[PDB]
Amino acid sequence: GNFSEIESQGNISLKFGFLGLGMGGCAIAAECANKETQIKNNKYPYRAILVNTNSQDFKITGNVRKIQLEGYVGEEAFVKHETKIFEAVKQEFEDRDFIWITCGLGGGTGTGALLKAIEMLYEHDYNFGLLLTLPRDAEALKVLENATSRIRSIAMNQEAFGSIVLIDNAKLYRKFEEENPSALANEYTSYSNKYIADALHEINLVTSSFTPFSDTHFDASEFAQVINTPGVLSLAKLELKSNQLDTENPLGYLTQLGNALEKGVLYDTEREELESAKKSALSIVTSPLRAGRLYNFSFLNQMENFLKERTPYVDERPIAPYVNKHTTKKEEDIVKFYSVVAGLPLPKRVSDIIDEITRI
């Protein structure tokens, strides 16, 4: 999670704002807003407004704005402080390009308050999306079936806003374990918030920090397009050595790429759900020496066909080759892939719950 080298010489594509709701949501939002970079004249690129009831845990500059709902978060308390909530949005997010309403599902923040925030930003013409966590415990999602749940209205109105970035806590916890086998569970949240913040910051950075090798780009404007696409969005990342990108024995590297597309950075996507994507963008980044030998029609055409067959309904999916002119000798043979796939369907676990609600 250290992008100091890339930052000093690069930039971010979108000035993100984060509207956190509830503990988990506010925790993620705060972490993103606390983000410190070496980007020149943009030390703290992200801003956040944290909406939560009063609490000591709430223990979480000037880039952050806290809004207490008292109650010492439900639809009622949200609506009862909506004027102050919106005034803070009006005063803190004027220079933002995109707002992420950050909320935990199955947690202590109802979908009722979530829908009200979505209605707010929509009625006021903001560019915004959803950054939502799914609980490690399935049993926690049953809350979505409760009498006051508005998960169905949110799902049915996906076209009103941008991408829904889902975060699978079960997934991040395992990465946390396999990563830090000696750490205590009590340390997970910290790691998690940081992983989420880094994932979003990384793609935001990569899309405005390197030199395009061709006329095909995955730049700030294309990133904006994808991020503003309705439906679920999945981020994927892969690093390989030059010697594996052998277009004559494509299975090694393509197997790795296909696996990365399904086992994303924050959520896992089924082959059949990916096939359902509406938008797709992918960037490759490597050294000047490697770029010269790697970026030819054989490789790029092979890449285009592979991706086309996996996301058949994507109108135009750019394969954008880039060169990191600042690549060290040690990183010289490394080839990095950054993928964004948008307009994905909601995952089965959530989708089954919505269908149950429609029946009822």
**Which residues on neighbouring strands pair with residue 163, listed in sequence order?**
231
Q: What DSSP designation does 116 have?
A: H
Instruction: State the pairing for strand pair 211-212/319-323.
Output: antiparallel
The answer to whether 139 is a known ligand-binding residue is yes
Q: Report the amino acid identity of residue 105.
A: L
Check the annotation: does 249 bind a ligand: no
Q: Is 193 annotated as a binding residue?
A: yes
292 is in an annotated binding site: no
Q: How far apart are the first and last CA of the chain?
A: 45
33 touches 47 (CB < 8 A): yes
Q: At residue 266, what is the residue type? A: L
CB 254 within 8 A of CB 262: no
Give the integer Cα–Cα distance in Å for 92 and 26. 16
Nearest to 133 by CA among 99, 167, 100: 167
192 annotated ligand-binding residue: yes
Q: What angle do CA 132, 134, 137 make, to 5 degrees?
A: 160
Binding site: what residues are annotated? 23-24, 108-110, 139, 169, 192-193
Give the residue ranges of the annotated binding site for GTP. 23-24, 108-110, 139, 169, 192-193
